[PDB]
């Protein structure tokens, strides 16, 4: 079997610039290289076949290339919707072998999180469980650490952490930190905090609650 090797695995380029994705086979595959693009939560679209010929309607920004065992796919004037997983399939001999993909991330300006801590719902409290939900929306860079602090004591157990993929309109990410707790445990305490540390600061972004009117 022919073996397509894709390295690197992640690529970041800014909007309007160039990126290039490198693919390589384990023997001269005589230019029989196809490139698919898999848009997040979509099927692949065939962009190029025979290393450089575009399929019907992939706009000329995408420039296939290469020879022998070394091929590359260039994209220019990179669009915030160019975010996808790019794969090379080879098409010379059976079986048709793919590559590992390369995620093309869009480098953006830094943006700081919009943090929302939410109390347990009365109805969840009725069921004997509490969940505090911290939302951290629209930050850039990617990396933000969130810690929970129940009455000054760092909670480090009981938290599920979900991140949105990169947004293809404003190129940002968003996180959902959920502390799931017991009614009786919720009521043993009172200060609950979602404290977050992202590049846009020094002094932690810190949101905290307990029920009072407004």
């Amino acid at each position: 079997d022919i073996v397509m090797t894709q390295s690197p695995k992640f690529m970041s380029t800014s909007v309007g610039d160039r990126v290039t994705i490198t693919c390589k086979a384990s023997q001269d595959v005589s230019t029989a290289v196809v490139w698919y693009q898999q848009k997040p939560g979509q099927s692949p679209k065939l962009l190029i076949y025979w290393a450089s010929t575009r399929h019907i309607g992939v706009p000329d920004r995408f420039a296939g290339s290469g020879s022998g065992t070394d091929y590359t796919l260039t994209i220019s004037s990179v669009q915030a919707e160019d975010l996808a997983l790019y794969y090379c399939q080879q098409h010379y001999s059976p079986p048709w072998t793919f590559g590992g993909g390369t995620k093309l991330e869009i480098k953006r300006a830094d943006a700081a999180p919009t943090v929302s801590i939410f109390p347990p719902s009365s109805e969840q409290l009725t069921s004997g469980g509490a969940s505090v939900v911290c939302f951290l929306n629209n930050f850039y860079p990617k990396d933000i650490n969130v810690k929970w602090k129940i009455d000054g004591s760092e909670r480090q157990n009981g938290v599920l952490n979900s991140w949105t993929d990169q947004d293809s309109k404003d190129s940002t990410y968003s996180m959902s930190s959920t502390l799931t707790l017991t009614k009786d445990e919720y009521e043993r305490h009172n200060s609950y905090t979602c404290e977050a540390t992202h590049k846009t600061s020094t002094s932690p972004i810190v949101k905290s609650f307990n029920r009072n009117e407004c």
Partner: protein
């Protein structure tokens, strides 16, 4: 133009057999064989094989000759893949995609993907909560309010805010399996004029249980 719709995603417990249907449209079935591909979650794309939609005879990949069986109902232009004795390691999204040429060296036009979760876990309906804030104006004249869909099986659930009308401002975070069940959440940010004045709602459908839920995020503060 060319459209290939696949079956709805299935839950099967280890050992069963599953026939995924790919009903092809737009082109002439008889002139273009079918490719079946495997998108594992942590692995990327795998050619499973191809079926001559003309002669009916299939070429399997090595990783698949033996529990997978391609077949087709040409009469309805449907190509079907079946997996016998489901080993949980068949957890993936199998794609049907058109073989542009003989043998499938180019899959132009792919189908939507059918997801397969091979689990012994019980189908569990979700419990939905409206996550109102302890007030807290979330940035300039915007209030963000949420909805938490908790403890169900299996994926998916269809969360929409306000019957689709609240499309901007929404972030639905990926569902995560805490061992036996799933937790989901989305936020939506609206201007203060809009809420609590207009009626914000979370509509959540978990079709596995046959569940349709509608939660008003009414101001509880």
């Amino acid at each position: 133009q060319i459209q290939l719709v696949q079956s709805g995603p299935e839950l099967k417990k280890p050992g069963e057999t599953v026939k995924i249907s790919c009903k092809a449209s737009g082109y002439t079935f008889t002139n273009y064989g079918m490719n079946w591909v495997k998108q594992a979650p942590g692995k990327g794309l795998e050619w499973m094989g191809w079926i001559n939609t003309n002669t009916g005879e299939p070429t399997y990949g090595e990783e698949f000759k033996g529990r997978f069986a391609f077949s087709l109902e040409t009469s309805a232009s449907t190509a079907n893949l079946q997996i016998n004795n489901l080993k949980n390691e068949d957890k993936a999204t199998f794609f049907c995609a058109r073989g542009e040429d003989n043998f499938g060296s180019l899959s132009d036009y792919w189908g939507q993907g059918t997801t397969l979760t091979v689990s012994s876990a019980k189908t569990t309906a979700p419990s939905v909560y409206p996550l109102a804030p302890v007030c807290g104006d979330t940035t300039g004249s915007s209030v963000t309010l949420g909805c938490l869909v908790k403890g169900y099986f299996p994926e998916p659930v269809t969360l929409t805010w306000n019957s689709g009308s609240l499309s901007s401002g929404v972030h639905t975070f990926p569902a995560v399996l805490q061992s036996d069940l799933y937790t989901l959440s989305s936020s939506v940010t609206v201007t203060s004029s809009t809420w609590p004045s207009q009626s914000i709602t979370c509509n959540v459908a978990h079709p596995a249980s046959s569940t349709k839920v509608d939660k008003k995020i009414e101001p509880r503060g």
